[PDB]
Amino acid sequence: EEECVRLYIQWLKDGGPSSGRPPPC
Structure with missing residues (x-):
């Protein structure tokens, strides 16, 4: 789903x- 929010989340x-x-992020 996300790539940078992924790192964020x-x-x-x-x-x-x-x-x-x-x-x-």
Whole structure:
């Protein structure tokens, strides 16, 4: 479906803004 949101949502899965990472997409 997505390619960069995919990397993003993957970020969402880790935590999103609640994760230790900044948003990738």
